[PDB]
Symmetry: C2
Subunit: 151 residues, 2 copies
């Protein structure tokens, strides 16, 4: 059972831009840890219908995580309202979420909130090494969220 | 040695409104843990010259923390620039700090960032029980900051 800010967390929405790289990876890391919770992802300007990035998928698979059957979707105001916690990769993205739904700033947090560096870099179209580095950061960040929500 | 967000933290500034209650308590909890670091506090509209609140002092003393020789001071833009980390008690206070110095949003965080509830209530002029409860929250929050900065 998960809690944050004096409320239950039943659903988590991971948000980035395209909904093909960091966000499906973050989603699936959380789902692996939280099989009974509703975990999804969406993009601020999504490649609607797209599957997970090939390199993101390769790297995740190497670490035992599947990005299979991901379908990229556009973030809507309704998704924001319905989610109990919204996680973004970079600080600038918080304002972007709040433009879609101004009422959710209070529950919009960094994916990397519980790690020292806070923000998580964008590996899209970068080297394999960038994807591996980012995966490790997301894995650590996701575990630290699970610990925080459940302790 | 302390770090946050890819930088050293040598100085921490704890900010609230009057600079007589939560903020001197938070300051002195951090100082007790971090004797070699520069730790101070300031108020968004301070009771300039005031000592720590009597009830805040009593409660802190019971837990082995001294608020002696506190002198309340007004937050300035220079203090904001000079501090490596600025900690506020409530989310609404972040924008208030940024009105004094717009360039410091990136290093302005909740005192309760590392605890589940995030925000820390205002005990000023409330019951002894409110001060005791808030002290415990601040103590936990401060320890979790020290752990995060140093691990």
């Amino acid at each position: 059972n998960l809690y944050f800010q004096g409320a239950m967390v039943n659903s988590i929405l991971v948000v980035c831009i395209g909904n093909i790289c960091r966000s499906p990876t973050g989603e699936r890391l959380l789902k692996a840890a939280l099989p009974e919770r509703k975990i999804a992802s969406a993009g601020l300007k999504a490649m609607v219908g797209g599957s997970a990035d090939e390199t993101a998928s390769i790297v995740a698979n190497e670490h035992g995580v599947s990005l299979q059957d991901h379908v990229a979707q556009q973030l809507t105001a309704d998704m924001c309202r319905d989610s109990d916690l919204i996680l973004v990769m970079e600080k600038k993205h918080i304002d972007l979420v709040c433009r879609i739904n101004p009422s959710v700033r209070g529950k919009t947090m960094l994916f990397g909130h519980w790690i020292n560096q806070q923000e998580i870099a964008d590996p899209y179209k970068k080297s394999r090494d960038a994807f591996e580095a980012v995966y490790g950061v997301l894995e650590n960040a996701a575990q630290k969220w699970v610990n925080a929500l459940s302790r």
